[PDB]
Design an enzyme around this catalytic site. Structure first.
Site, PDB file in Angstrom:
ATOM      1  N   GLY A 250       0.808  -1.237   0.000  1.00  0.00           N
ATOM      2  CA  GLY A 250       0.000   0.000   0.000  1.00  0.00           C
ATOM      3  C   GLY A 250       0.833   1.275   0.000  1.00  0.00           C
ATOM      4  CD  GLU A 251       6.552   2.891  -1.950  1.00  0.00           C
ATOM      5  OE1 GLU A 251       6.970   1.748  -1.671  1.00  0.00           O
ATOM      6  OE2 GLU A 251       7.221   3.728  -2.585  1.00  0.00           O
TER       7      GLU A 251
ATOM      8  CG  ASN B  99       0.373  -4.779  -6.267  1.00  0.00           C
ATOM      9  OD1 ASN B  99      -0.642  -4.162  -5.936  1.00  0.00           O
ATOM     10  ND2 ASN B  99       1.579  -4.387  -5.896  1.00  0.00           N
TER      11      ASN B  99
ATOM     12  NE  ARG C 251      -4.167  -5.274  -8.416  1.00  0.00           N
ATOM     13  CZ  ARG C 251      -3.657  -4.144  -7.935  1.00  0.00           C
ATOM     14  NH1 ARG C 251      -3.999  -3.715  -6.729  1.00  0.00           N
ATOM     15  NH2 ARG C 251      -2.799  -3.447  -8.663  1.00  0.00           N
TER      16      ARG C 251
HETATM   17  N1  LIG Z   1      -4.171 -14.053  -0.760  1.00  0.00           N
HETATM   18  C1  LIG Z   1      -4.747 -12.946  -1.208  1.00  0.00           C
HETATM   19  C2  LIG Z   1      -4.749 -12.631  -2.597  1.00  0.00           C
HETATM   20  C3  LIG Z   1      -5.358 -11.497  -2.981  1.00  0.00           C
HETATM   21  N2  LIG Z   1      -5.946 -10.668  -2.068  1.00  0.00           N
HETATM   22  C4  LIG Z   1      -6.637  -9.415  -2.471  1.00  0.00           C
HETATM   23  O1  LIG Z   1      -7.910  -9.732  -2.980  1.00  0.00           O
HETATM   24  C5  LIG Z   1      -8.349  -8.651  -3.848  1.00  0.00           C
HETATM   25  C6  LIG Z   1      -8.937  -9.217  -5.119  1.00  0.00           C
HETATM   26  O2  LIG Z   1      -9.444  -8.124  -5.929  1.00  0.00           O
HETATM   27  P1  LIG Z   1     -10.677  -8.298  -6.939  1.00  0.00           P
HETATM   28  O3  LIG Z   1     -10.257  -9.125  -8.106  1.00  0.00           O
HETATM   29  O4  LIG Z   1     -11.279  -6.957  -7.195  1.00  0.00           O
HETATM   30  O5  LIG Z   1     -11.713  -9.141  -6.060  1.00  0.00           O
HETATM   31  P2  LIG Z   1     -12.415  -8.721  -4.689  1.00  0.00           P
HETATM   32  O6  LIG Z   1     -12.016  -7.309  -4.393  1.00  0.00           O
HETATM   33  O7  LIG Z   1     -12.169  -9.793  -3.686  1.00  0.00           O
HETATM   34  O8  LIG Z   1     -13.961  -8.755  -5.095  1.00  0.00           O
HETATM   35  P3  LIG Z   1     -14.865  -7.596  -5.758  1.00  0.00           P
HETATM   36  O9  LIG Z   1     -13.874  -6.583  -6.296  1.00  0.00           O
HETATM   37  O10 LIG Z   1     -15.660  -8.284  -6.841  1.00  0.00           O
HETATM   38  O11 LIG Z   1     -15.740  -7.029  -4.661  1.00  0.00           O
HETATM   39  C7  LIG Z   1      -7.121  -7.736  -4.018  1.00  0.00           C
HETATM   40  O12 LIG Z   1      -7.218  -6.592  -3.179  1.00  0.00           O
HETATM   41  C8  LIG Z   1      -5.956  -8.637  -3.595  1.00  0.00           C
HETATM   42  O13 LIG Z   1      -4.857  -7.928  -3.070  1.00  0.00           O
HETATM   43  C9  LIG Z   1      -5.940 -11.000  -0.708  1.00  0.00           C
HETATM   44  O14 LIG Z   1      -6.487 -10.234   0.098  1.00  0.00           O
HETATM   45  N3  LIG Z   1      -5.330 -12.141  -0.309  1.00  0.00           N
HETATM   46  N1  LIG Z   2     -10.177   5.688  -1.918  1.00  0.00           N
HETATM   47  C1  LIG Z   2      -9.507   4.568  -2.154  1.00  0.00           C
HETATM   48  C2  LIG Z   2      -9.112   4.216  -3.478  1.00  0.00           C
HETATM   49  C3  LIG Z   2      -8.430   3.071  -3.643  1.00  0.00           C
HETATM   50  N2  LIG Z   2      -8.142   2.261  -2.582  1.00  0.00           N
HETATM   51  C4  LIG Z   2      -7.368   1.002  -2.744  1.00  0.00           C
HETATM   52  O1  LIG Z   2      -6.036   1.327  -3.059  1.00  0.00           O
HETATM   53  C5  LIG Z   2      -5.416   0.171  -3.680  1.00  0.00           C
HETATM   54  C6  LIG Z   2      -4.524   0.622  -4.812  1.00  0.00           C
HETATM   55  O2  LIG Z   2      -3.754  -0.512  -5.285  1.00  0.00           O
HETATM   56  P1  LIG Z   2      -2.319  -0.311  -5.970  1.00  0.00           P
HETATM   57  O3  LIG Z   2      -2.460   0.517  -7.201  1.00  0.00           O
HETATM   58  O4  LIG Z   2      -1.652  -1.643  -6.067  1.00  0.00           O
HETATM   59  O5  LIG Z   2      -1.545   0.561  -4.877  1.00  0.00           O
HETATM   60  P2  LIG Z   2      -1.219   0.184  -3.361  1.00  0.00           P
HETATM   61  O6  LIG Z   2      -1.640  -1.240  -3.153  1.00  0.00           O
HETATM   62  O7  LIG Z   2      -1.748   1.254  -2.472  1.00  0.00           O
HETATM   63  O8  LIG Z   2       0.377   0.250  -3.364  1.00  0.00           O
HETATM   64  P3  LIG Z   2       1.417  -0.931  -3.713  1.00  0.00           P
HETATM   65  O9  LIG Z   2       0.618  -1.931  -4.526  1.00  0.00           O
HETATM   66  O10 LIG Z   2       2.530  -0.276  -4.501  1.00  0.00           O
HETATM   67  O11 LIG Z   2       1.889  -1.501  -2.394  1.00  0.00           O
HETATM   68  C7  LIG Z   2      -6.576  -0.772  -4.056  1.00  0.00           C
HETATM   69  O12 LIG Z   2      -6.640  -1.889  -3.176  1.00  0.00           O
HETATM   70  C8  LIG Z   2      -7.824   0.107  -3.896  1.00  0.00           C
HETATM   71  O13 LIG Z   2      -8.962  -0.625  -3.499  1.00  0.00           O
HETATM   72  C9  LIG Z   2      -8.531   2.628  -1.289  1.00  0.00           C
HETATM   73  O14 LIG Z   2      -8.242   1.882  -0.341  1.00  0.00           O
HETATM   74  N3  LIG Z   2      -9.215   3.783  -1.107  1.00  0.00           N
HETATM   75 MG   LIG Z   3      -1.249  -2.856  -4.420  1.00  0.00          MG
END
Ligand SMILES: Nc1ccn([C@@H]2O[C@H](COP(=O)(O)OP(=O)(O)OP(=O)(O)O)[C@@H](O)[C@H]2O)c(=O)n1
Ligand SMILES: Nc1ccn([C@@H]2O[C@H](COP(=O)(O)OP(=O)(O)OP(=O)(O)O)[C@@H](O)[C@H]2O)c(=O)n1
Ligand SMILES: [Mg+2]
Ligand SMILES: [Mg+2]
Lengths: 180, 180
Positions: free
Chosen positions: A60-61, A95, A98
């Site tokens: 989450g950087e 990352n 998903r």
């Molecule tokens: N072992 C894992 C693998 C993945 N993830 C997280 O599960 C999410 C999957 O994203 P997405 O494909 O959008 O599915 P969900 O968010 O679970 O469901 P939806 O967006 O349909 O509500 C991501 O934040 C990913 O980091 C996790 O928590 N644990």
């Molecule tokens: N208002 C928001 C908008 C986005 N997100 C979340 O921010 C994440 C962005 O993912 P990513 O682009 O991979 O960036 P980070 O996970 O924050 O950083 P990194 O993957 O580099 O560790 C997603 O899980 C998204 O649901 C959030 O929590 N609140």
């Molecule tokens: Mg991320």
């Protein structure tokens, strides 16, 4: 150990984080999105290996940097004991594991905001932290024929090409032109 | 109110969730990934509007379904009071406000797992919940010339096309063929 709000200032990045590059365009959208509805997914950290009473961001950087620009004083964190192998694994998993939303599933979501909830394309843009342009272009795809939409539903029609097709003054005309 | 573990059985989906379609291939990868390192991002829920002592998933349906298949008894949740407009907004934001990892940043991450930590492509596949095929193909991209990598760094070369280009017996030959 659950998830808690913590002062943004006691968090630091891992230099060996799988993600090297950070585009300003995207980071601006996230900071906007965070300014509205805040940080929605808590930031995964381990206790800092170098500095006392500090936390090293595992996942989450962007959230941390976006929240910083957005001028948030605290952020939601989850602290777990993790060695350098765990962090690199988790860093990749969050990352890599998903699935992205279909651009049409996105467009329909915006339609429902307009019709069911009477939101303007400006109201949507402001709340989701994207441009009015992006919203308008995304919705224009709903106009296109069922066949060309089936191409986007299937993925045949390139998702990148979709935003371009949408921007066109005559968008539906670019359907047959996609073959060549 | 932070995040807590909760019995998976007292969670239900919102039918009006922005995401309609769920590919088996992807859901299998997530359930595998969850079977190893568990659910890493807590699932966002509101108290069920229809049923007592139940929670309606606002964000994280795939996680819930993956964890179900993975045979997890409890899941990490965050309960927030949210009306039908809030949920649709958040539903879009969590999936729309996030940046994908470059396929080369992914490949380098796997290199470091091999070299620094002495992990086999099988060890990686098992831990990240992807196929040995996906891992091998992803790493093969590091071999390719700086020019074609620049295409992937830029995005010109389709990320989907990359794994295919990698699989080819003569991969670099597909560079000039990317004209079409
Ligand atoms: N072992 C894992 C693998 C993945 N993830 C997280 O599960 C999410 C999957 O994203 P997405 O494909 O959008 O599915 P969900 O968010 O679970 O469901 P939806 O967006 O349909 O509500 C991501 O934040 C990913 O980091 C996790 O928590 N644990
Ligand atoms: N208002 C928001 C908008 C986005 N997100 C979340 O921010 C994440 C962005 O993912 P990513 O682009 O991979 O960036 P980070 O996970 O924050 O950083 P990194 O993957 O580099 O560790 C997603 O899980 C998204 O649901 C959030 O929590 N609140
Ligand atoms: Mg991320
Ligand atoms: Mg999601």
């Amino acid at each position: 150990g659950g998830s808690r709000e913590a002062p943004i200032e006691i968090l630091q990045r891992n230099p060996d984080q799988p993600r090297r590059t950070f585009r300003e365009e995207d980071l601006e959208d996230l900071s906007n999105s965070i300014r509205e509805k805040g940080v929605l997914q808590p930031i995964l950290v381990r206790p800092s290996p170098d500095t006392a009473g500090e936390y090293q961001i595992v996942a989450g950087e962007r959230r941390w940097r976006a929240a910083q620009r957005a001028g948030l004083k605290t952020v939601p964190i989850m602290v777990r004991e993790l060695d350098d192998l765990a962090v690199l694994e988790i860093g990749i998993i969050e990352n890599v594991q998903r699935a992205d939303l279909n651009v049409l599933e996105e467009a329909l979501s915006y339609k429902v905001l307009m019709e069911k909830f009477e939101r303007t394309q400006e109201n949507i843009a402001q709340t989701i932290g994207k441009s009015r342009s992006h919203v308008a272009n995304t919705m224009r795809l709903l106009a296109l024929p069922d066949e060309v939409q089936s191409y986007l539903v299937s993925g045949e029609l390139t998702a990148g090409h979709a935003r371009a097709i949408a921007a066109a003054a005559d968008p539906v005309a670019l359907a047959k032109q996609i073959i060549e």
